[PDB]
Design a protein around this ligand. Sequence first.
Ligand code: GRT
Ligand code: CL
Lengths: 243, 222, 231, 196, 204, 241, 244, 250, 125
Amino acid sequence: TGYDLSNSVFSPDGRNFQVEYAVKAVENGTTSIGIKCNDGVVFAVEKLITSKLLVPQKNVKIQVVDRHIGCVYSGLIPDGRHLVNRGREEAASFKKLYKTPIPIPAFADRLGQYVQAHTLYNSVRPFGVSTIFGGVDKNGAHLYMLEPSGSYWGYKGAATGKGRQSAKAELEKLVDHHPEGLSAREAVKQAAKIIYLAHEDNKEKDFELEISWCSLSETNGLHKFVKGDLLQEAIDFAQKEIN
Amino acid sequence: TTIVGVKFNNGVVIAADTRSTQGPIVADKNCAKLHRISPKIWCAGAGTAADTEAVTQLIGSNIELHSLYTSREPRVVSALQMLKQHLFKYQGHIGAYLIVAGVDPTGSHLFSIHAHGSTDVGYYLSLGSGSLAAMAVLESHWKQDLTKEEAIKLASDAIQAGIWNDLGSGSNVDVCVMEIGKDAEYLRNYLTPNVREEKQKSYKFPRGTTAVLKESIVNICD
Amino acid sequence: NNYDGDTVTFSPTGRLFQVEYALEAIKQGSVTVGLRSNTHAVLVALKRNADELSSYQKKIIKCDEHMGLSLAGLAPDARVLSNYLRQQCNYSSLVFNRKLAVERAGHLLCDKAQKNTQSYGGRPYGVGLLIIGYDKSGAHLLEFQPSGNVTELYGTAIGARSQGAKTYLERTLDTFIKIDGNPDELIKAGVEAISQSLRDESLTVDNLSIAIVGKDTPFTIYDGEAVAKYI
Amino acid sequence: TSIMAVTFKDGVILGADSRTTTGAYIANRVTDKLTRVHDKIWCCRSGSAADTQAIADIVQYHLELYTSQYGTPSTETAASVFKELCYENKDNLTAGIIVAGYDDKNKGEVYTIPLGGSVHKLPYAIAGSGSTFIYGYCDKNFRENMSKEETVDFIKHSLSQAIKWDGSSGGVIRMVVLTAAGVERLIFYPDEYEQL
Amino acid sequence: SDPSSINGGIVVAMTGKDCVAIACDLRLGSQSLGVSNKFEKIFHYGHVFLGITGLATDVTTLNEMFRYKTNLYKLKEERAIEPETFTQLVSSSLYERRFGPYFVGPVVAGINSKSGKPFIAGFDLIGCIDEAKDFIVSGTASDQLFGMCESLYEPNLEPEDLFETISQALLNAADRDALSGWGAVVYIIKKDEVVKRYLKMRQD
Amino acid sequence: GYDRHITIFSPEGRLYQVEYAFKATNQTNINSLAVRGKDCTVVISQKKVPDKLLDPTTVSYIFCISRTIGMVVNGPIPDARNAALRAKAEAAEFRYKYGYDMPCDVLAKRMANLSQIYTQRAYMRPLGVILTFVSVDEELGPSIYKTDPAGYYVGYKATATGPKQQEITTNLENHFKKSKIDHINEESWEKVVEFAITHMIDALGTEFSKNDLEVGVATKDKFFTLSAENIEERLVAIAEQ
Amino acid sequence: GSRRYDSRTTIFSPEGRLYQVEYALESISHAGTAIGIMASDGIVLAAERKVTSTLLEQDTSTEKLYKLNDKIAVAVAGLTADAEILINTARIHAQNYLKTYNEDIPVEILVRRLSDIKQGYTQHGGLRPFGVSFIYAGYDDRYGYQLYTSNPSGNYTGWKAISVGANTSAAQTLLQMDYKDDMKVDDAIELALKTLSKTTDSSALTYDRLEFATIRKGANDGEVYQKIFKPQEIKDILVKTGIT
Amino acid sequence: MTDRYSFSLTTFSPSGKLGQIDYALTAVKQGVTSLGIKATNGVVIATEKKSSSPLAMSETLSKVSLLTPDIGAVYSGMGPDYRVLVDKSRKVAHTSYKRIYGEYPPTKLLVSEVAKIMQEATQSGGVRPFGVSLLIAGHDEFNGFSLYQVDPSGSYFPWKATAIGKGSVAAKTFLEKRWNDELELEDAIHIALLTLKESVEGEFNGDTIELAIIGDENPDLLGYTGIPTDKGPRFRKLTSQEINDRLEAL
Amino acid sequence: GYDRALSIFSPDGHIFQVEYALEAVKRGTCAVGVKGKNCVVLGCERRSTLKLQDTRITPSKVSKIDSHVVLSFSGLNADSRILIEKARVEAQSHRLTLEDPVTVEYLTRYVAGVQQRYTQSGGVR
Ligand SMILES: *[C@@H](CS(C)(=O)=O)[C@H](Cc1ccc(CN)cc1)NC(=O)CNC(=O)[C@H](CC(C)C)NC(=O)[C@H](Cc1ccccc1)N=[N+]=[N-]
Ligand SMILES: [Cl-]
């Protein structure tokens, strides 16, 4: 054997074991989710409070690309930052040549091709993150999830990390109970609940909630963080549902 | 130089004179200005003679390789695009002015190319120092729906206008006919209206006329 | 085992062993403590010597007038990273006439360490850093690890026996955070914190190293007879 | 050269003469200066023939590749590509381009790109050597939301005058209509437009 | 400071009945100053003869370059290069320096060993081939040589007669050019013998 | 045994990495089919959406390479998209350089040559995909050309790819024995799509809803994919006969 | 990364030998035997073709003997493809020297440079060495007639008579026995053929399994001629010495 | 990132073998049979068209390829490796020869250039050898008709007649009996078909056999007229119908 | 370019590639140097398993680096040519810039520096 020692090597199955090993690092990380809604998208993430010495609200994990795209990830945090840095370069060159801000499907393939390229050679390591991202463009709202292999699809809802199965189950209920659609303000409240419910799989350390959103009506098509009264309202909604 | 291209019923014809010059001096009284890019795509060249020949040979080589790669007969627009992108890259420093003409699976085509990399389309075209003499004949006698024999006559008449009226052009008329569905026929020295008259005297010298200092057998063998 | 030959290889459980071995070099290094209030931020570092005839290895490095760090692990790697920080702080000043935010300083160190963990031939950095600074949003303390992970904190400690000081600061959190407009008292709290990581040895005049930055105080380092006040 | 693009109710119309000159000699009297960079995005070329031709080919290439990946490009996107070439190679280019196109959302749009490489979005645009003679006429006679027949007359009359006074302009008047209906090519001969 | 007319010199080639002739002057100068009266401008690579006029440094350089290339050709091909092929090699080599050219006017001459056909050719500095049945000229007295050849030449001349015609063409042309003369050499080339004669000419 | 990790010969003259790339082809568990009409070329492929949270409109293995060329992939989506982007770029560059639309068979050759390079050069791995290119070529007419990780390519009267490829292949073979011709003797493309779906139903033995299939059609001067409702209309026509 | 798959072609063994060089020499020992003999008035090159087939075109063939310039030739033993890479390099180097100095290259200078190329492949670059041994036969006006050999190590030495390839041990003993310093070319021709005829692995030595060449001053007055023997000329010289 | 394989992947083993070349030759042995025969007035090259599927159009896959108007090539072994070699061989004929001398290279020299390309894949960094053996037939004015074989090592040999691939050992024996120095071209085509029938198993007709000749000049295949010196390509690929005509009088 | 670190340390603090190069020297033919009051003498062994040699043209064991300095060696013969060539070039380069021939100490220091560079350069032995 030895087929799992080097990246870009096919095993006798037709599998790249190094990529599957990178998926394990992703499964080890904290929970993160994405919810598509009527006219936009909502993102949320679990931040583990390791110590009292961590400054609240001052270790931000959700990242913005351009002005209209949000990105969140689970796994190796530095690898995620590297991927966003590239995303920001790709989005910048698109806007430079073609004027219009990069469409979400167009942006999705730019990350996809870059991540896929890191499965082609033994001189590089695959990415240790699954990345949930999306935003609003000319054709409306788009939510995407990208994996270490370079694989990505569009989603109604998406989840990754240690509590992915719990969150996926809760997401599937929202798709069934709301066939006509879910509103943006509702999706923020639901996102809070789904992080609190998914925290049951990581309950030794208590946590800090962080939410962001893009909506055609509520945020005018731009990416913003949820803070203050609207954040506390979503926390209280989540607290009431666990009890 | 005088060069023309004329479209007709089932194809296209190009023609040229046969004079080559260095300044006011005639270097070659019977050069062939009709170059071959591909079997059914022919090229007529004016401007700097080394450039027109060099550029035509390069693109003809790359066209052959492309034809073999694609398993298809080469198209005139491929030669046009490759020529014009090459010339444009050199900003007019390659002084080639060409009339490109040929038949391919798409049909019959006639284009012109300039040293800076611009191109034109037309039913009748002319390039070179005798282009104005030729274009005058073309503008007077050209019509829509020309036959093969009519187009050859019109083309060679336009070249003759250059031969007689332009000092840069002279000697004979070359023609190449490219009809659809047939082989292209190259008509080297199609007209020879400038034959040198018998000289008044023979200048054969008596043997021994030239004074010699040294004789020696030269060794060419190994 | 078979998956620790280089940094480009993942283990079957999804671990990067070369990165974890680099993390081990920090644990071998001498203890250093960081803490802040709202007005000031303080670094306290225990220096180490080869023997009685040798000097004590300098642990604290200045990056700008408003920013600097303390190191634990491979000192040459700290020199490379601190030099990179000096350049980035300087680029921010020359081009934008802007003091580099302590948060952006961390983001830049993270991205530099990451590239070394994803390419063949290279190796991870073998050092951990505590960055303090005062910028437009007040006092700051950061913890850098060579995995790439950077974290903002009220207080912390890294190196050998760092868990003793880290527990003390976790108890003292409510007290030392409100030491505003008083440098000497914030240092005293830091000197008392590092003391919880000492075994057999005590804090002497050429052993202790303290640094401070704040509202009306540039990043300055104290060594020798200047630290005799706090013993 | 005389070229113009004009927005109207149903979309946009591009117009041009057919004369190409090498000094005072007319090298081509039936030139097509209206060129397709995409299905419903066309441009009018003025300046160096070689430069505009090379640029238009590169733009057609960029937009074909854009369409393969991201679907149909906007007219603004096409103008941006033209600009990027003209601006970054300003020292080696002599190209004055008018870009015109039809979206279904944005309807008809016109962008003009002069020598520098600057971009200017306008209701209508004129360019080329012969445009100097019709600034006064076009300003007085242009109206927004014109009909197709009204816009064709406006362009025909305008270019007719540009041709009359500019020696570098002449031949036939070519036009290209861009609407939801599709793409229509029009031609107008001297015997018609000269006696307007 | 015109590279093609600093050193001076001339070359001429002609065809006959089953033969060819190539001839050159011997002068090398620096503008008005005559320096050498032994500077031959005709070289040969097997049975293919090459004459080169123009800037003398480039004449020497190209001879050394074509010797190099025809030697490698013979090693790989296992045969001597023919005139038609060598002509194409010259054209290629000159055009390779299109925007920094050798300031020369080369002339190829020889008999194809397979077909027996007499062959001559000429080039500009930049590589353009000039093929001809009758004659080729090159150098600072090219105008003069063109006039002499066009009047004196007739087709199908015997080797002994062709020698007289080409010698008289060169000599009388050279005497009307200030930068040409100072001696002359004529090569008469038959299928399998080559005679080289040095001419007596006026030394001014 | 490092001769099984990189693309170098083994003692019996084999490239194991290439062979294992062929096995990655079936990792998605999807079957494709391609046939030619008089005027058109039809390609069909199964569409499987297991997760309820997925947006089914973004799940696709058919790609529009150029206006005239379409491509369906059998293999993982990252490599599929890698190959698609490259093919799109190659087709665009061909048009720019040579002044006419890249033919289907020429693009196939070019992508096949690229695949060959990954079998010879060590640092690059093969892509675990089989690319099926379709068009109505202006010189050769209806065309089907297929590429694999070995770098092999050939034209086809018809073809099939996937886990149950052999069953579909023999089903089509038997039809062309009977009809005595190289293509589907049919006027409209609608009925050629109906033929394709019918013969896939017979070979695989499964019934299809509107969301279980994915259809691509190549006509003169355009290639396009069908929507769910376009397929549903096509399924109704088969059922009523 | 790629470290895993590196053979490390340019390293030393614990005994201080170069693995790849030693193994390349093992390859060369199975190649057809080539002999060079230097006489007072010329040089002989003889070589045995590798197991010929009856349908091989013999007259228009070149396997063993190659011309570098008019004054220098080489006999090959090893991989032919590898030899041709090195031969074209040598042919070029000879023409560079002629272009620079207007004199034919001295034999040793050409040999040294070709050998220095082989040396480079054993010290750096991580590539396999050339699996080739040459016998160089040539003439210049400094040292006259000269025989050299080079091998994959890049080491070269001079010889009065020498063999490379298969059965060199046996061949070198036979040459050492019958060779003397006052020898003529025609005698050396006979010695070369007699040596191959005894060391051959074939049943009998025939014209169709041989390449032969001489470098004499047998041209007209003070000049060197290279003769690569034709099939019929090898047939006649084989009858004349009484082998067939 | 970047190609870190800057070292040889083909090395000498203790026994003096070059492993990867031997293994490449093994791949050639597995490949379908192809052959070549030289006549007095021409050369013939032939091979079986092994179809991957009956749905596949075997006309689109061309095993016998034109390299120049007077030179053709056929192979045994890995088809993709051959296809790229034909591309590189066609290009090198132009860049290293026709663009310099204004004429096509003679057979022996083009063969030499192909051999060089194959040798470099045996020594250069991060690459395996080509898994094919080529048979190259051609004509040129000064050497006449000729036939060459090229192996994965880069070695090449001239042949009166030979075969490579699956049933090469039996085919070479058959050719030794039938070959003489007075063979006309039609006689050589007849023998080529007889030799190939032995190695083929399934159908044997013009649709399963691929055969081309290097013979007389073909003015009809030139595409143009007017230049007397240009007389047309000596390479001609025999049609499906032209093969079946000769199979009746077999 | 070929980068591989061929000369590296081992657990016991030895660079094996450098030590194995010393074994190649030990295999080579003997060479001796003796310096007197007003001279230096270089003696060299030549192995006698090689008869039928041509001693006129065979490479001599002692090589002139300049007209006043000589170099003999033991080890791989092909390797020695590369050092001799570099030394000969540096000898002429020193005459060109300093206007004085090399000292024996300087020429040695140069050759030794070249030998050292090949013990910590990638891709080389
Ligand atoms: C007519 C062109 S014209 C007068 O501009 O209308 C012909 C066209 C032509 C002739 C011959 C062929 C055959 N390949 C193809 C086209 N062109 C000429 O008469 C132009 N003649 C030349 O360029 C001369 C050819 C020599 C073979 C006589 N060469 C020169 O005049 C060089 C040009 C040059 C010099 C320096 C730098 C660049 C170019 N003059 N000199 N010395
Ligand atoms: Cl390719």
